[PDB]
Design a protein around this nucleic acid. Structure first.
Ligand SMILES: Nc1ncnc2c1ncn2[C@H]1C[C@H](O)[C@@H](COP(=O)(O)CP(=O)(O)OP(=O)(O)O)O1
Ligand SMILES: [Mn+2]
Ligand SMILES: [Mn+2]
Ligand SMILES: [Mn+2]
Ligand SMILES: [Mn+2]
Ligand SMILES: [Mn+2]
Ligand SMILES: [Mn+2]
Ligand SMILES: [Mn+2]
Ligand SMILES: [Mn+2]
Ligand code: NA
Ligand code: NA
Ligand code: NA
Length: 326
DNA sequence: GTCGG
DNA sequence: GCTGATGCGC
DNA sequence: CCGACGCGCATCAGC
């Protein structure tokens, strides 16, 4: 965190462009600039120094100069003081409320946790669950707990069918000490790019996790994707564990590695690897790696039996999940 | 907001 | 009541 | 200096 002051500012700037401006690309630009600086091994002493890095342009170089000189950023003082921006920014902290709904609630004078309680009948099911766990969802999950959660999920899955294969990905797979949520990748032999589909592969597992009361609520659920809420077992009287966000994604077994690579991240890493693979005549998504034709049309899915295979296809030195946290 | 074209 | 349109979070 | 940088699910506006 040699440049924690700078990256903190680029992030808050990023989130403003995301929630308020609804400018997803400026959002990206800011996270990208904060991502390269976070990887910069020297304490930045001036914007010009920062400007040398790809992602850090003119406007940001200046903001850095100001931050380095003033200890703060006026543009951000204004943002935190502006009632509209601050309310919208706050509302998006509730799961289920994105930029659009937050901005609408605000146009109607709904801008605080209290107003949501008051105007609850206006919220959808997902948003209601979001408000109910507003405090719990913002809590980081200690790896120590991510481990207990892993065992419960892996165990319950094996209890359903011994051939299932759940793999906890995301920041956890990256070896992080604490995580935002818990992401689980699932596969079964009876489900591949063909198989004429298998009904309820994800259901059964989700249903079992509910049977042992690990999963407490559902935000959205489909045949391949599940977003919900869970909670470690509570002693028998003592303090209850915080409710946590869990995501389960069922992917075809013959696409497992491309899937673990994606759901493992990091998010900026994926954006980085994708762009690279595209400079190398390949196109990568969360399911397959395809070669790009002389024209630009993606050929068929190359074979993949390991994350490294994907690194090889794009002339990139394989990096362990611990070195992808960009 | 950035940078390759 | 249906569905194209859009929002949401990953 | 211009302009590229999406998916599986839920909901509801416009019929
Ligand atoms: N828009 C996007 N573009 C590219 N990749 C994206 C993505 N959204 C999610 N991903 C992928 C990579 C993340 O590691 C992975 C998990 O998505 P996630 O939102 O759970 C964040 P994670 O990286 O696990 O850290 P944490 O904050 O939860 O502790 O999903
Ligand atoms: Mn150096
Ligand atoms: Mn009020
Ligand atoms: Mn995660
Ligand atoms: Mn997730
Ligand atoms: Mn019960
Ligand atoms: Mn509870
Ligand atoms: Mn490259
Ligand atoms: Mn432009
Ligand atoms: Na630069
Ligand atoms: Na939100
Ligand atoms: Na539809």
């Amino acid at each position: 965190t040699l440049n924690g002051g700078i990256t903190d500012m680029l992030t808050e700037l990023a989130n403003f462009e995301k929630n308020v401006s609804q400018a997803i690309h400026k959002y990206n630009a800011y996270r990208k600039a904060a991502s390269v600086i976070a990887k910069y091994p020297h304490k930045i002493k001036s914007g010009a120094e920062a400007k040398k890095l790809p992602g850090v342009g003119t406007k940001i170089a200046e903001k850095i100069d100001e931050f380095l000189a003033t200890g703060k950023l006026r543009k951000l003082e204004k943002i935190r003081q502006d009632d509209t921006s601050s309310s919208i920014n706050f509302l998006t902290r509730v799961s289920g409320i994105g930029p659009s709904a937050a901005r609408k609630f605000v146009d109607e004078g709904i801008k605080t946790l209290e107003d949501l309680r008051k105007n609850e009948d206006k919220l959808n099911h997902h948003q209601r669950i979001g408000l109910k766990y507003f405090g719990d969802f913002e809590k980081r999950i200690p790896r120590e707990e991510m481990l207990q959660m892993q065992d419960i999920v892996l165990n319950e899955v094996k209890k359903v069918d011994s051939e299932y294969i759940a793999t906890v990905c995301g920041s956890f797979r990256r070896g992080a000490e604490s995580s935002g949520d818990m992401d689980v990748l699932l596969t079964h032999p009876s489900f591949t790019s063909e198989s004429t589909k298998q009904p309820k592969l994800l259901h059964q597992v989700v249903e079992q996790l509910q049977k042992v009361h690990f999963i407490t609520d559902t935000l959205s659920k489909g045949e391949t994707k599940f977003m919900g809420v869970c909670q470690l077992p509570s002693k028998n009287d003592e303090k209850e564990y915080p409710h946590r966000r869990i995501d389960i994604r069922l992917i075809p077994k013959d696409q497992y590695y491309c899937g673990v690579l994606y759901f493992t991240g990091s998010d900026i890493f994926n954006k980085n690897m994708r762009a690279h693979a595209l400079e190398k005549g390949f196109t990568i998504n969360e399911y397959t790696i395809r070669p790009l034709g002389v024209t630009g049309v993606a050929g068929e899915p190359l074979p993949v039996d390991s994350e490294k295979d994907i690194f090889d296809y794009i002339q990139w030195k394989y990096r362990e999940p611990k070195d992808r946290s960009e």
